[PDB]
Amino acid sequence: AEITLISHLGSQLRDGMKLATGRIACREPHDGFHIWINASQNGKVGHYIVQNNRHELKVKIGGGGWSSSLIEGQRGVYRQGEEKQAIFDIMSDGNQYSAPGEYIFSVSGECLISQALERPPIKATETIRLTV
Amino acid sequence: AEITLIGSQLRDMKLATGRIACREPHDGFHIWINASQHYIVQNNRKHELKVKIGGGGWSSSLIEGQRGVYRQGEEKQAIFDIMSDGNQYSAPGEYIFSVSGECLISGNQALERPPIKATETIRLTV
Amino acid sequence: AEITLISHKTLSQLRDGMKLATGRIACREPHDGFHIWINASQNGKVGHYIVQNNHELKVKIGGGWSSSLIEGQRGVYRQGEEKQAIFDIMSDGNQYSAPGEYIFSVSGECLISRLERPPIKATETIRLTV
Amino acid sequence: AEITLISHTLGSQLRDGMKLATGRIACREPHDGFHIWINASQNGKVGHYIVQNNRHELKVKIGGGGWSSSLIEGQRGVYRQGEEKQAIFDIMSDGNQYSAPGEYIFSVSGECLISALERPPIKATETIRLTV
Amino acid sequence: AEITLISHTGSQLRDGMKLATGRIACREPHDGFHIWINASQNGKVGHYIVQNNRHELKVKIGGGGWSSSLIEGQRGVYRQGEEKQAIFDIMSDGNQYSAPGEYIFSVSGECLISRQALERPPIKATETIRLTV
Amino acid sequence: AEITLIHTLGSQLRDGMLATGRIACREPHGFHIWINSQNGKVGHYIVQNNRETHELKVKIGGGGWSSSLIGQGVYRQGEEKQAIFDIMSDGNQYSAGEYIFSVSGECLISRLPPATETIRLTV
Amino acid sequence: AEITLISHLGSQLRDGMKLATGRIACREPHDGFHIWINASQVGHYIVQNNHELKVKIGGGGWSSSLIEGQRGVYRQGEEKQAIFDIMSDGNQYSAGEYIFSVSGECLISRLERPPIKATETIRLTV
Amino acid sequence: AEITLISTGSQLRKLATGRIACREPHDGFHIWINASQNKVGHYIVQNNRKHELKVKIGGGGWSSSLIEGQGVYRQGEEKQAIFDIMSDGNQYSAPGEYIFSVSGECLISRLERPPIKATETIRLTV
């Protein structure tokens, strides 16, 4: 429901290298989070390809306590919890030597609600400028 | 549509294993446990045994409808586990719960629930 | 020992807790906890400060962060062996903001279990522009 | 900090001190006293004004107890003691007058004063349509 | 006894946010004010849920200087005072999302009378206002 | 129908403060309580000394207590047995003495009944 | 210098559900208060049954602190007295007795710790 | 804007050494100790928990300064500058704790003080 993204990069990206950190925060009570990147999926759920702003970069989203998900019917990564905020990373997906410059894309996410469990009516979206 | 299923401390490992098979053309699989919610299965005859289902060719899923885990796929069979959710101890008595599952159909990657649902039982011998 | 700050835009009425800036403290070498502060005038409670325009702004730092003195250094603290921690610079109480810019200098360290302050300290600057 | 103005169609016959509109000023921050005024040409004493129709004139004053006229450097207005969070005020007919029907549109500004004592960096300002 | 309502227009609402603001005027002598919304209660008097025309806003009424009340035995919020008028708001009851559409707030109120020992008067006012989201 | 009460302080006192009260309603039943001095904020009070007619600003509740009129205080909904509460200072002030509070309370029932205790404090 | 403790029902535990309520009193002039629970731990704890429990301390005007190098919750004031709570945090269940050890100092601003330290024990009967 | 401070005998005649760094372009450095004055750059430090010890700051790459009412300064656009906090002459020191702090700013040609100053504290037994 509220998403903050912090940018950090250099061309040599090792696998699982942290490219950007993110935080999703929820103001109303909730059970669980899910997030995703608004880009073409590149293989497994949560892995993606993003274009240079004038060259490509393979990223993935998540980190500890996140794992891939399909939630009516939004593909992303999911983490359980009722806490107010959760941390996540955007990581390099594989070793890659990337062309310098800006890779701009957005991230979305929701604070899931409940006995049923449900997507809230509003999703957050924030844009990040990833600089290589 | 077709499911076959197979100490006092544990963290992390197996408790039962299983396969869901889907004879007809389909797009994915979809399974869960029928118990309170990752689940908590109530003792028979006060303590709470924590379990989870899947195995990570499986993904956390909410379809309609139903929470549980899923896997995209046109193949016939898919294997899964029933594990223990984190470190825990075990009180005596029996533990009884069940596993359901369905062969998902794509309308058109848009996974949807089919008419038939399989359910199998576990009376978990301690 | 590595800090990245971003600022939030918008707009004259700040509500208590409102996020002015967000930061990431990263520790690459193994460690036991984080430790951050603002280089700015103290204002009552430990993680609370006063920053000037060019009108002044009352702010606080943190968010699972605890007020702390470590070897006499005031700041906020969190236990953690994880690689990174996120923090905010927030409005302390309701107040207004004169248009203009407020410079926040933030410092931080990766504490080590044997608590001890390291010999290396990060320091970064972000400007809140109103 | 926050001003709301609600107007009582008033009719052309305006008796002295007749309520034409009701206002509220609300302060978040801790504060010592309130401070309000109309952005129009002063007309005699402090807190007394003339407003022109949106094509004749209307004579109004602001306050109504315990509001008192004030110069708070260097802003002329009317003023109220306290640390309470809102205070209510009136806009009144200043003297008996017979007024041409229609709209008299003007703004009202004000500040929460802070404790020793001084003005805050910004004032509030709201617009009222007085309908005769 | 006399009530005037103004409405304030995204999709979200923070706790305490003003959806509408109102005045209750009392010409005749009185020792208090007494208001409520005519809608399904929801928890504390006077907190309510309001239907969209098709979606539920939880709203609350009163604000600074209004205490929840139960007078003969009308539930609402109240305020002592002999002054001629009083300002109140209709506020978002917690953080929530707003389905678009129309919401009708129907507000009633009364100029309380004494014989400190407050009593309901013979006059009640009711006014309608439509919130647009 | 059951209240228990309890507190030095020294002259100095800010806002926010023991106090302490505690009303017990264990028969099938709401909770409101009050101090037995009208001062414009229900339920905020003023209590005179035992020398002449000094005085003190005071309020009751503290947490899940809202101001209310029910022709009587502050109040909390819930069906539990006890209803813990405090009484604090209404304003930071000086105070050169003994001030005594009558505290009352009731148990509110159904679809909206026929307890008074006294406490004293010292500064 | 001095701490005094008081217990309190049911077996279900939600959030902020008080469990005890103590009071701390430094006679000598001093700038503040400073208290914790002695249990393997933020100011939130786990206190075993003689299974477990999860618990928090402070409430009111109390905030998490770390003061050279004692983790607690603290507050300021020359006020010769201060009052606090030990309470639940979020939904949970509870199977007898629980003993909390509770300590506390009075701080100085010279904010530092004195040689004198209080410790009191209190029982949680459920 | 950025300083590193390296900082417990009854007798003495270097209590700490430190550097101030200035990453953004600037034209000089300005530092001082927070404590009662004694020349300018010379200070008298009291001990809470009576007596006092005379300290002085800099090291003669440093000149006595008063900039907008406030220590010692040094011209230069390089990124760093080193300084010492040394005992002001031979003196005796009774038991107790000696607390004080050092601050510095990066001066700009356009000289005058920037909005940012960094501070570091020293505390001493003997």
Numbering used by the authors:
A (entry chain C): 1 to 8, 11 to 56, 60 to 119, 125 to 142
B (entry chain E): 1 to 6, 12 to 17, 19 to 43, 49 to 56, 59 to 119, 121, 123, 125 to 142
C (entry chain B): 1 to 11, 13 to 55, 60 to 68, 70 to 120, 127 to 142
D (entry chain D): 1 to 8, 10 to 56, 60 to 119, 126 to 142
E (entry chain A): 1 to 8, 10, 12 to 56, 60 to 120, 125 to 142
F (entry chain H): 1 to 6, 8, 10 to 19, 21 to 32, 34 to 40, 42 to 58, 60 to 76, 78 to 79, ...
G (entry chain G): 1 to 8, 11 to 43, 47 to 55, 60 to 104, 106 to 120, 127 to 142
H (entry chain F): 1 to 7, 10, 12 to 16, 20 to 44, 46 to 56, 59 to 79, 81 to 120, 127 to 142
The authors write:
Different AAF variants are expressed by different EAEC strains, where they are required for the bacterium's adherence to small and large intestinal mucosa. As with Afa/Dr polyadhesins, AAF consist of two secreted protein subunits, a major subunit (A) and a putative minor subunit (B). In this study, we report X-ray crystallographic and NMR studies of monomeric, donor-strand-complemented major and minor subunits of AAF/I from the German outbreak strain and AAF/II from EAEC strain 042 and provide an atomic resolution model for the structure of the entire fimbriae.
The minor subunits AggBdsA and AafBdsA have more similar structures than the major pilins: 117 matching Cα atoms are superimposed with r.m.s.d. of 1.2 Å. The donor sequences derived from the corresponding major subunits form classical donor strands (Gd), each inserting five donor residues into the subunit core structure. As such sequences are only available in tip subunits of major subunit polymers, the AAF minor subunits are likely to be tip localized. Furthermore, the significant sequence identity with the AfaD tip invasin (>60%),which has been visualized as a tip subunit, together with the ability of AggB to functionally complement AfaD mutants are also suggestive of a similar localization for AAF minor sununits. In minor subunits, strand A is not split between the β sheets, but locates entirely in the sheet 1. Instead, strand C2 that in a classical Ig fold is hydrogen bonded to strand F, in minor subunits is hydrogen bonded to strand D and hence belongs to sheet 2. A conserved disulfide bond also stabilizes the minor subunits. Interestingly, AggBdsA also bound to fibronectin but with significantly lower affinity (∼100 µM).
